[PDB]
Amino acid sequence: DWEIPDGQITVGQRIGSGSFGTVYKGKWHGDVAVKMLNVTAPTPQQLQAFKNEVGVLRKTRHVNILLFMGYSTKPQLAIVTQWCEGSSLYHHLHASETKFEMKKLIDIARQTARGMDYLHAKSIIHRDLKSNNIFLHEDNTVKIGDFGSILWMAPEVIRMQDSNPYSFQSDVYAFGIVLYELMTGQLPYSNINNRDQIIEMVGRGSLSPDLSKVRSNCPKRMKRLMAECLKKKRDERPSFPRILAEIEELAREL
Numbered sequence: 429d430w431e432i433p434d435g436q437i438t439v440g441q442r443i444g445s446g447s448f449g450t451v452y453k454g455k456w457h458g459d460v461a462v463k464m465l466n467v468t469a470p471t472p473q474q475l476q477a478f479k480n481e482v483g484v485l486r487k488t489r490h491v492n493i494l495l496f497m498g499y500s501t502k503p504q505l506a507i508v509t510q511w512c513e514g515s516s517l518y519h520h521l522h523a524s525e526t527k528f529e530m531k532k533l534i535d536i537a538r539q540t541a542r543g544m545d546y547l548h549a550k551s552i553i554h555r556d557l558k559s560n561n562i563f564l565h566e567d568n569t570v571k572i573g574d575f576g577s578i579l580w581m582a583p584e585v586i587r588m589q590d591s592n593p594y595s596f597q598s599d600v601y602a603f604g605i606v607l608y609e610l611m612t613g614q615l616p617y618s619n620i621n622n623r624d625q626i627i628e629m630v631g632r633g634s635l636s637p638d639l640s641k642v643r644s645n646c647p648k649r650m651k652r653l654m655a656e657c658l659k660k661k662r663d664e665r666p667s668f669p670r671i672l673a674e675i676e677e678l679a680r681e682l
């Protein structure tokens with residue numbers, strides 16, 4: 429059992445917020461992040477729903493997945509994880525503009541594939557993967573977390589006509605854009621000027637990333653892999669086991 433007794437966790441400074449929760453730097457046996465939920469006086473239906481989430485995070489032990497550490501119910505509902513020192517991949521690519529060589533790009537890609545392969549092997553779907561949620565701890569280890577971001581949405585998710593739009597396949601499409609970014613240094617749809625046009629065309633099936641924009645030294649295997657992850661028909665995208673293996677072969681050739 430992972431319930432952290434009351435008065436042990438010190439809560440510091442507000443970092444920000446994502447899909448759910450508000451995130452803080454904290455302390456508990458060293459550094460932790462503290463994701464507050466803001467539920468005051470949980471009903472049995474909110475309490476069990478909290479433990480359902482806890483029970484999905486607890487199911488993950490992997491080096492490339494953000495490390496679930498504990499939870500509080502008093503004084504707030506809250507989740508404690510490992511603290512990533514450094515900043516995110518989004519930040520490294522379109523803020524710092526950090527000059528990674530291809531060795532490092534593909535390494536990052538490989539470590540993210542490992543995490544997603546793990547997530548999928550344990551039947552867990554991310555639902556909001558993006559470079560913003562790929563944390564480079566110590567500028568070396570990818571930590572995936574965070575289970576206004578339509579550039580990573582697959583067509584079937586932007587449509588939302590299906591009963592179950594989120595899937596492994598939509599997780600795989602999202603990874604394809606993380607690859608676009610990695611290999612172009614750029615967010616996709618550079619020159620389309622209004623998100624409503626990007627939504628429409630992706631959803632109607634008439635707009636995917638222009639892969640002629642990839643950097644000169646981009647591998648040919650990686651070109652092919654991106655193309656296959658970014659396919660419009662759901663069922664024609666590769667599973668992560670194969671994504672991982674093509675990048676692991678790629679990493680060696682390099």
Ligand SMILES: CC(C)(C)c1nc(-c2cccc(NS(=O)(=O)c3c(F)cccc3F)c2F)c(-c2ccnc(N)n2)s1
Nearest residue numbers: 444445446451461463485494496507511512573574575
């Ligand atoms: C800016 C933004 C996107 C709001 C952030 N969220 C978290 C954060 C903080 C805590 C948990 C989760 N992820 S989670 O809540 O989805 C989760 C768990 F709570 C447990 C295990 C895996 C996991 F992904 C986070 F994304 C961040 C975070 C996490 C660890 N270290 C640092 N420096 N930041 S940054």
